[PDB]
Amino acid sequence: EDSTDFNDKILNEPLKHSDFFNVKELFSVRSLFDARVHLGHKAGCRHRFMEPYIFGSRLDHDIIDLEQTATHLQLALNFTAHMAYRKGIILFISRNRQFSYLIENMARDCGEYAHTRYFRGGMLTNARLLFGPTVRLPDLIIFLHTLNNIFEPHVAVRDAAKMNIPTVGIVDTNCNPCLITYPVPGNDDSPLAVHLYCRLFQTAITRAKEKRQQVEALYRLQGQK
Amino acid sequence: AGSRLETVGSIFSRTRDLVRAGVLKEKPLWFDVYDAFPPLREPVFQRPRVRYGKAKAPIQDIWYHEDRIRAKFYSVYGSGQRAFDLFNPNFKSTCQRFVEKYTELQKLGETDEEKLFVETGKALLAEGVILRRVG
Amino acid sequence: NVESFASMLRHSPLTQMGPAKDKLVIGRIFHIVENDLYIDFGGKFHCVCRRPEVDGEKYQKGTRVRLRLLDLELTSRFLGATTDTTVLEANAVLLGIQES
């Protein structure tokens, strides 16, 4: 009764709107271009399954179609905002050693979790035997660098696919987006691009949590009166 | 129970079938969001394979009409003294300025390409742009 | 009315630069580790140089310097590999310090 009404007016309401959290204003094509998102690796480093996302090659350097990047980023931010709205656990995973400090700071500010260190085997497929029998697995994993330090796909995406955990991942011109739920074709090496991604995701999570509190407080006030 | 077969369908397809069969008593938190806003491509594991035979990558090079002008100015008159400032979105190098003047004279309608190149050099000399040929 | 991605790419300074070989650019130092200047320019990757032996003390963080780029990214395909091994860095020569 009351619980069903609570769920309908709070959880099911944003699902009826195309952009309930208004993430379109966060980013634009020119903003991505100024952040060097379109840049990619060499044509010899190009990986299969990224050709549709690659706009072309400019002097043995791949260029990513920012039109597709904007659409994929819009879907990824919308999914991230809804998960944050639903009190979901968001984990930022990145094996890059240049932005580990920045990503951990982002997790602290947004209230979510991060994993920028060596990924020990069994952190997801065998989490109960390590953390504890009643551990709660993350409801969403965001990859800022899907490749490990040996230029190969990370094991976390495969583990997340095994555990049915949706993944939002930044994929460059040498990544494998086959098992990534929301691939965002962009640049994972430019500091400006990484900072832009952190700010956009942090803003989306923060807005979602604030709007969840506002809607819940309004619903309680309406219930009282 | 769940399913850990990451190579058999997507996470959504496996979850939907398990819920339909009743194996999963409760749907996950992300199920409703995924259904409402599905991604452009459903994530399904596909093995990459090598392109044998005459197959070639569909990725094509990026070229423009002004690339001929840039190559010619990089060969004759060499690189400009001004250092490229790629931080500035509105940076204009000597080669780019030569290209713009060449394009403007082309818009005027000069026929000879050699005369067009010479006139572009004359315009830069009139404007005061330093033109130090390598040879 | 809205600028298209093709228009942005066509008029981008990196596109009109042409080949990166023997081109003078301006970089900015953002990280120093044991006489290693991690200079950053308007590219995908940074370039690591050594502090000059002559008046190298002025090379600090935020200093703008002049570089002669040789390659935007050092990738090479070796024997038996199916892809080009990359160092995730560019190649450049530290000419001096930009002065206004």
Binding site: - | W63, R70 | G18
Partner: peptide, 26 residues
């Protein structure tokens, strides 16, 4: 449509093929 789309061209920056010191000499 749009005139800013890349066109199909051969590489204009391509350097000429290198020749040996005895090329063209009997």
């Amino acid at each position: 449509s749009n005139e800013d789309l890349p066109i199909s061209m051969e590489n204009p920056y391509k350097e000429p093929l290198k020749k040996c010191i005895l090329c063209g000499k009997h």
